[PDB]
Design a protein around this ligand. Structure first.
Ligand SMILES: *[C@@H](C)[C@H]1/C(=C/c2[nH]c(/C=C3N=C(/C=C4\NC(=O)C(CC)=C4C)C(C)=C\3CCC(=O)O)c(CCC(=O)O)c2C)NC(=O)[C@@H]1C
Ligand SMILES: *[C@@H](C)[C@H]1/C(=C/c2[nH]c(/C=C3N=C(/C=C4\NC(=O)C(CC)=C4C)C(C)=C\3CCC(=O)O)c(CCC(=O)O)c2C)NC(=O)[C@@H]1C
Ligand SMILES: *[C@@H](C)[C@H]1/C(=C/c2[nH]c(/C=C3N=C(/C=C4\NC(=O)C(CC)=C4C)C(C)=C\3CCC(=O)O)c(CCC(=O)O)c2C)NC(=O)[C@@H]1C
Ligand SMILES: *[C@@H](C)[C@H]1/C(=C/c2[nH]c(/C=C3N=C(/C=C4\NC(=O)C(CC)=C4C)C(C)=C\3CCC(=O)O)c(CCC(=O)O)c2C)NC(=O)[C@@H]1C
Ligand SMILES: *[C@H](C)[C@H]1/C(=C/c2[nH]c(/C=C3N=C(/C=C4\NC(=O)C(CC)=C4C)C(C)=C\3CCC(=O)O)c(CCC(=O)O)c2C)NC(=O)[C@@H]1C
Ligand SMILES: *[C@H](C)[C@H]1/C(=C/c2[nH]c(/C=C3N=C(/C=C4\NC(=O)C(CC)=C4C)C(C)=C\3CCC(=O)O)c(CCC(=O)O)c2C)NC(=O)[C@@H]1C
Ligand SMILES: *[C@H](C)[C@H]1/C(=C/c2[nH]c(/C=C3N=C(/C=C4\NC(=O)C(CC)=C4C)C(C)=C\3CCC(=O)O)c(CCC(=O)O)c2C)NC(=O)[C@@H]1C
Ligand SMILES: *[C@H](C)[C@H]1/C(=C/c2[nH]c(/C=C3N=C(/C=C4\NC(=O)C(CC)=C4C)C(C)=C\3CCC(=O)O)c(CCC(=O)O)c2C)NC(=O)[C@@H]1C
Ligand SMILES: *[C@H](C)[C@H]1/C(=C/c2[nH]c(/C=C3N=C(/C=C4\NC(=O)C(CC)=C4C)C(C)=C\3CCC(=O)O)c(CCC(=O)O)c2C)NC(=O)[C@@H]1C
Ligand SMILES: *[C@H](C)[C@H]1/C(=C/c2[nH]c(/C=C3N=C(/C=C4\NC(=O)C(CC)=C4C)C(C)=C\3CCC(=O)O)c(CCC(=O)O)c2C)NC(=O)[C@@H]1C
Ligand SMILES: *[C@H](C)[C@H]1/C(=C/c2[nH]c(/C=C3N=C(/C=C4\NC(=O)C(CC)=C4C)C(C)=C\3CCC(=O)O)c(CCC(=O)O)c2C)NC(=O)[C@@H]1C
Lengths: 75, 266, 162, 172, 172, 172, 172, 172, 162
């Protein structure tokens, strides 16, 4: 489980030096992503590594696209 | 666009470009191509030295530790990106470079300049850069796995028409890069919500005949003029002059207090 | 600029679609609200001077220290009182704009965005403006739909300052 | 963008004064005709496809050199782009009709369109001709008296025609 | 503009070098071709009105949409402009043939011609078709064996063909 | 950006020779001036908010038309952008003071600021007046004698004054 | 971009006509030349590194101002960028040879290259000189008769020479 | 254009009030430095040819690629154009020194000069290097303490240095 | 570029007419001269190094002060001597170009235009270059049409410099 070196921004906030793994399921075609140029490849459990400072953004992104955050684990 | 306008505008390669998606179980050469595409487009087609390569970021991309979007973000936040696009550039030029590199388009509004300026002033370079990559626009166009590509030459949803025209001010050709501190070409255009005529590829050239001088070269002078003589009919003016009359035309424009916006070979 | 009509077009254009019945109902809601908003703005405009002076006096009453402490940010002199009356008049005038516009768009564009920077760099207490807005709420004398929409704008400003 | 109310609002804030009684009564007049504005928007929307298609057919009949091979409307890709541009112009005209202000039409659609068409080689005069045909059609639907409450929609028709005139002036 | 000699001279000056023996020999070879080049110029010039007129007649015969009312060659002014254009292209082709370099044709005639044609709606493909008609008409006139010293003119025919194709590519 | 050292280095590398003895002694003289340079940077930084606010207050006092409704500093966002511009100019002046070179101030702040202001209508002359207010406010702060080791800071004061003047000249 | 087939296809589609017998015969003649075209591409590719290195060495020997300090090929980064430009031009020339059309050069390699060189201060005439060095070396490699089936490759060599000359004229 | 007095007059007229006592005193201080300003202008004018010729020699010595064949200053016509450009910049810098304001330099010399050099392929960075050479020679000539009433001319020398930096920044 | 062919086309183009027999005779005259010009260029090129060195020595002999007086404009050092040989080589090379082109067009475009501004700015005596061209005239060893056309370009440069 690597990634924290590049995921955590170069800002030296101790709060920001924390990454978390999101497990997302059911990434469906919804009205929110009708004009998505790319196509969904997997609707099962996908793992997204999110730094602390972007956890606000990512979960919103997951929630607009119908994905279900089933688990969140410290990295 | 179609071929007939594409050759004239010099955007044939952009039109025929295919989005590059890192699929699951990709081989080594696919990751190599994806890394190369990200370096080409995020760093604005510079000759990237091997010593400037992000060895750890591309290792995480290779080993499936991070997504293409994360690798794009790592390149955008890297000191290499800072050096060639941020530390020696004005803020407005810097964010149009961000729009070109990260979203593949030109800025649409002066409010987008007002945004990312306050955001820089409050939250630093990192928050300002993360605004583009975490934006709704980045998610529907590129997602987590598609290398960003230039989209300003094609009709997008929730797009202003000026974007297409302004695209030619930020994309100067296939063999061009964003390397030289330079000021934005879109400053006055964005601030006053205007559009500039597109002079790209073969669009800039005009007929010469016998009117051009000794060396058969015409120059187009786009100027902003007011009444300082004869009546001025338009605020914007375009002058086509030969090389032999270029200095004289420039000097009489200067003594009338007219502001020269652009000079191009026609 | 948040207004019902502009947001309906913003949503439709972001989806690249023609205006359907959803946007028509948005316009219908704007139409049902517009007359009450227009009468609200006119009532506030005709009563603007008494409201501004009374609001300034209410702030001076609740925060007496503003009227004897020397300093650029206070109103112990006539210059400070003029600045205070002018700020409350700006608040009152922009609220009338929101009533005319049908949304908080005038407040967002002209007053709310950057007010935090201003109150801090010129060390103005947002509590002063909260009491001024509270006085306008208690003394605008509006009733019904006009009162409800005007109080929403005044409470929007209050929640922004608090 | 701006709507009919926020335009007056922006002008008043720059002057730094309250809206006068006359401006408030003008906006009261505007919301009195709000229902006709909604009807016109709905009527153009309900026949948008017919408006675009009939105008395109008439345009290609009057200007056969567009669909002639080598023309700028020849090939499916260019024909599809042309029909999309007609629908886009019509959609933004309806947006300007809905708001009561032309800012959405200018800022998002019309600004930069002349330069775009000149750069693309799209004949601005032909697009202007297509917009007049859509204008002619759309005012017929807006002014159709069948199945609607009787009233005078001359003012809103002139406003819609003004938006269509802006579109035609912009492309050429 | 450049001719066949000064093109090589300009390249050498940019390099700061004397012309090599091979370049001087190549220039001697084209000096030995000079009589044939003058004959080609003379033959196209002496048939210029016939070349333009027959090419134009064939072009409208095979493309009747140009001369139908509303077509780009319809009306005597636009028809005259089209004929003039044909004569202008042909004349600059003879200039290029005379000089031995396409610089006069490219710089004075072709540069910006496509932009002019696009902006006017002049169909560049049919202009290219018309230049293609002048192409074999002039090439058969240059290659007519009667009343001339016999010799092989294959190189000059190929060069004139290149000037004609260059003009055709620019307009289309 | 360059600092006081890399500026000499880049010029020398372009010339392709080592720094001469005199250049090394000049840089050594800059080094012996370093503590006062750090003190000046620290003093302007420590009073930066006071510098910006007092300069802005004085600027709006003598230019009531900036804050008058319709003025360029009217509305909260424009006023906040105005205070941000003052703070930005002060910050790059401190950066230039720290590096001993004006490149960071020129490249990041002043390059394009004048025509940005002209395009947007921000009065550059008023910005210059505000920068001049920060100038003497910061120069009194840098030259304040109490609570610091005594010495001659006239050269550093002249350099900081030059940065402020460069900024004032660029915006106008 | 176009290859040798799609070029005449695009011309024919603009005319809206089928390919004539002469065009089809010319394409068949191009097809009979295909093996030699593949050989020429293969020979340039197999010696690309030698072509670039030798041409760069010759260019820097002839123009030593490039590699001295302050020159545009001085420093490792600038030298490596120069070497990459030489290799890139050679690669796109091979693409043009492979496709039989020059459109890959104009669409990609020479699309804005002169603007890039002027903006950076790269001397375009020196680049043109370097392209000419690659030209003579690559043409010699293509024409080498050893280890290949004998035949006339003059037409493909003339075509390759045209691609190299077009790249040189793009930057000179 | 503006001079030092008309610059503050223009700022006052936009603001619509009289020059304050502080502004009049600053102008009187400008008047008190006027003799030194006339000396600096006179000293640069009397040595204009020396400044231009020496700066050009130093520039072509440090950037030899400008004068090798194919370089932009090679050929007499381009070298004379380059010397004339040195001359024009120096003359407009003296005008700015004379008027006490940079408007003449911006509006009549630097207006569109970078775009002009880009259009012509003139290397703007090398023009900036030449302007920097003229700067150092001219400031030395103005600071020469022989045969003049002694006095501190640091303010005018700093002002002249600023004009030269403006020229060098505008061309590159 | 003043050449018979380019000038013939230019005159015809200003009148907008095809090339008549007059332009064809210009081409015929160019053809009559061109072979002699090409051999003249070959002979000058092959003898270029001795001609340039000999011309430089002739100037140094006629104006000995150039090799012994300090100053940037003189050839008292190796740097000045290299500049002098380079200038004479420029003169000789552009003369061969004229012989190839069939006119003074290369000399006009590359050397003659602006040469007087050069000699003034850099305090270079045109008499030095006149002596060099006189040496080249006296030592090129050409005969007939080659000699006449080459002497015309060399005399053209001399007349321009004087
Ligand atoms: C010119 C535009 C034409 C015209 C219009 C017109 N309409 C009305 C009245 C109304 N029309 C509506 C509209 C809608 N109700 C809905 O639910 C929907 C779908 C969302 C729509 C579009 C409404 C609510 C009214 C008011 C009630 C009524 O039914 O009358 C009028 C009458 C005056 C008014 O402004 O209300 C008019 C004039 N009539 C014409 O003659 C033109 C062809
Ligand atoms: C292909 C172009 C055709 C062709 C040409 C050809 N011409 C000659 C020779 C000559 N042609 C001329 C021309 C002119 N003399 C004049 O007085 C005029 C009017 C100004 C002209 C145009 C001349 C002077 C000659 C040389 C003398 C002669 O008449 O023979 C040749 C012979 C070889 C040569 O180049 O000298 C050729 C091949 N021949 C063909 O078969 C083509 C159809
Ligand atoms: C000018 C280009 C030189 C030249 C070429 C030439 N080649 C052939 C014939 C062939 N060359 C190939 C090529 C390849 N076969 C492979 O497997 C590979 C690697 C993928 C390559 C590059 C082929 C298939 C042939 C045909 C078989 C044969 O060997 O004859 C010819 C002969 C004519 C033809 O078109 O086939 C020629 C002329 N010859 C020269 O002398 C030039 C130096
Ligand atoms: C810095 C620029 C140098 C410097 C200048 C300096 N000059 C003066 C004084 C004067 N110089 C003049 C000039 C002229 N008299 C003429 O007739 C002409 C030709 C038109 C010129 C150029 C004049 C009139 C004066 C005043 C009388 C005098 O001769 O002194 C000063 C003295 C201060 C003052 O402003 O009067 C100074 C400082 N001095 C230096 O040390 C620098 C190298
Ligand atoms: C070498 C013969 C000469 C030379 C070259 C030189 N070039 C650059 C910089 C760039 N070169 C390109 C060109 C391309 N990039 C592409 O992707 C394509 C293919 C379509 C081309 C043709 C570009 C865009 C640049 C910009 C910068 C970049 O890093 O990409 C330089 C670097 C200049 C600098 O570092 O400032 C150099 C040195 N220089 C010489 O002196 C030789 C004559
Ligand atoms: C009154 C409730 C209290 C008070 C007021 C006071 N305000 C200021 C200064 C400013 N007020 C504003 C506010 C606005 N400007 C706008 O454009 C708008 C939006 C449309 C608003 C709300 C600003 C920006 C300032 C600073 C600039 C200016 O002076 O105009 C002062 C003076 C502060 C200073 O340092 O000069 C004062 C005194 N003072 C009290 O004691 C009351 C309780
Ligand atoms: C049809 C009546 C005419 C016509 C149209 C035509 N348009 C294009 C291409 C584009 N159209 C636009 C316009 C917009 N894009 C937007 O997002 C907006 C809304 C804000 C507008 C108004 C743009 C930007 C393009 C170029 C990009 C793209 O094509 O997606 C074409 C295609 C041109 C080509 O060569 O591909 C055509 C054909 N052409 C005619 O002949 C009719 C008169
Ligand atoms: C004829 C084969 C086709 C055709 C032609 C056509 N051209 C125009 C108009 C112009 N042609 C030019 C071109 C030139 N002018 C020059 O001086 C030169 C040399 C440098 C050239 C090549 C120009 C400038 C124009 C516009 C100005 C003018 O009208 O003279 C027209 C008229 C277009 C119009 O609407 O007026 C036409 C008809 N049209 C066809 O359909 C043929 C396929
Ligand atoms: C305040 C003293 C004066 C004033 C200021 C003012 N400035 C703007 C807008 C901008 N200022 C800048 C400048 C920078 N932004 C940066 O990030 C950098 C540092 C790298 C600089 C130098 C820019 C780019 C803008 C435009 C974008 C933005 O809006 O932030 C405004 C707003 C103008 C407008 O809203 O149209 C204002 C008000 N105005 C005055 O009247 C004072 C004299
Ligand atoms: C010399 C340091 C560098 C250089 C210069 C160079 N410039 C040109 C050509 C022009 N320069 C100008 C500029 C002006 N003309 C004016 O009248 C004024 C006042 C407004 C200015 C500043 C212009 C307009 C031209 C072109 C027209 C003309 O020459 O009259 C050239 C010639 C380029 C060419 O001949 O193609 C040159 C060589 N070149 C270098 O390499 C030096 C760095
Ligand atoms: C030799 C006969 C005498 C001599 C020569 C000398 N020349 C220079 C300097 C220059 N010479 C030129 C001339 C040209 N440049 C061109 O591009 C061309 C046209 C193709 C010509 C004829 C120029 C422009 C210069 C100045 C810039 C440069 O150095 O290139 C010098 C040096 C002068 C100086 O101040 O550096 C010298 C010494 N000197 C003698 O004593 C001989 C008798």
């Amino acid at each position: 489980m690597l990634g924290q070196s590049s995921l955590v921004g170069y800002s030296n906030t101790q709060a920001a030096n924390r990454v978390f793994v999101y497990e997302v399921s059911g990434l469906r075609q919804t009205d929110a992503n009708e004009n998505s140029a790319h196509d969904i490849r997997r609707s099962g459990s996908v793992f997204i590594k999110v730094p602390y400072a972007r956890m606000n953004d990512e979960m919103r992104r997951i929630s607009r696209l119908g994905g279900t955050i089933v688990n969140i684990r410290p990295y | 666009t179609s071929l007939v306008s594409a050759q004239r505008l010099g955007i044939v390669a952009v039109d025929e470009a295919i989005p590059l998606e890192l699929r699951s179980r990709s081989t080594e050469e696919e990751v190599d191509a994806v890394i190369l595409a990200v370096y080409r487009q995020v760093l604005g087609n510079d000759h990237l030295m091997s010593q400037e390569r992000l060895t750890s970021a591309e290792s995480l991309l290779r080993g499936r530790e991070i997504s293409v979007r994360d690798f794009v973000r790592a390149v955008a936040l890297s000191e290499v990106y800072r050096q060639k696009f941020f530390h020696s550039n004005p803020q407005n030029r810097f964010i149009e470079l961000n729009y070109k590199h990260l979203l593949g388009r030109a800025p649409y509004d002066q409010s987008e300049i007002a945004f990312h300026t306050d955001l820089y002033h409050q939250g630093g370079y990192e928050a300002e850069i993360n605004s583009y990559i975490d934006s709704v626009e980045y998610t529907e166009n590129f997602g987590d796995w598609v290398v960003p590509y230039f989209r300003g030459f094609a009709t997008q949803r929730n797009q202003k028409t000026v974007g297409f025209s302004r695209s030619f001010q930020v994309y100067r050709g296939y063999a061009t890069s964003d390397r030289s501190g330079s000021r934005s070409r879109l400053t006055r255009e964005l601030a006053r919500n205007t559009a500039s005529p597109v002079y790209a590829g073969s669009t800039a050239e005009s007929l010469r005949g016998t009117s051009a001088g000794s060396r058969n070269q015409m120059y187009r002078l786009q100027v902003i003029q007011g009444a300082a003589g004869t009546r001025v009919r338009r605020g914007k003016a375009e002058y086509l002059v030969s090389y032999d009359n270029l200095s004289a035309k420039l000097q009489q424009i200067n003594r009338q207090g007219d502001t020269v916006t652009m000079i191009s070979l026609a | 600029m948040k207004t019902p009509l502009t947001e309906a077009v913003s949503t439709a254009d972001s989806q690249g679609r023609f205006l359907s019945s959803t946007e028509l109902q948005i316009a219908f809601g704007r139409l049902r609200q517009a007359n009450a908003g227009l009468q609200a703005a006119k009532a506030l405009t005709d009563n603007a001077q008494s409201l501004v002076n009374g609001a300034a006096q209410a702030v001076y009453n609740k925060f007496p220290y503003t009227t004897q402490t020397q300093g650029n940010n206070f109103a112990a002199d006539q210059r400070g009182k003029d600045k205070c009356a002018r700020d409350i008049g700006y608040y009152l005038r922009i609220v009338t704009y929101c009533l005319v516009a049908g949304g908080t768009g005038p407040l967002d564009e002209y007053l709310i965005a950057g007010i935090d920077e201003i109150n801090r760099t010129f060390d103005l207490s947002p509590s002063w403006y909260v009491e001024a807005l509270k006085y306008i709420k208690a003394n605008h004398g509006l009733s019904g739909d006009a009162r409800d929409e005007a109080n929403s704008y005044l409470d929007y400003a209050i929640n922004a300052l608090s | 963008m701006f709507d009919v109310f926020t335009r007056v609002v922006s002008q008043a804030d720059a002057r730094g004064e309250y809206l006068s009684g006359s401006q408030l009564d003008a906006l009261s007049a505007t919301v009195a005709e709000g229902n006709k504005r909604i009807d016109s928007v709905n009527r153009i929307t309900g026949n948008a496809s017919a408006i675009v298609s009939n105008a395109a057919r008439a345009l290609f009949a009057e200007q056969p050199q567009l669909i002639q091979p080598g023309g700028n409307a020849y090939t499916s890709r260019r024909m599809a782009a042309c029909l999309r541009d007609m629908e886009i112009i019509l959609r933004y005209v309806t947006y300007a009709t809905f708001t009561g202000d032309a800012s959405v039409l200018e800022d998002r659609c019309l600004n930069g369109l002349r330069e775009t068409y000149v750069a693309l080689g799209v004949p601005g005069a032909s697009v202007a001709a297509g917009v007049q045909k859509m204008k002619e059609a759309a005012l017929d639907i807006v002014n159709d008296p069948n199945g609607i409450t009787r009233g005078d929609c001359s003012a809103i028709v002139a406003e819609i025609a003004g938006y269509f005139d802006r579109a035609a002036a912009a492309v050429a």
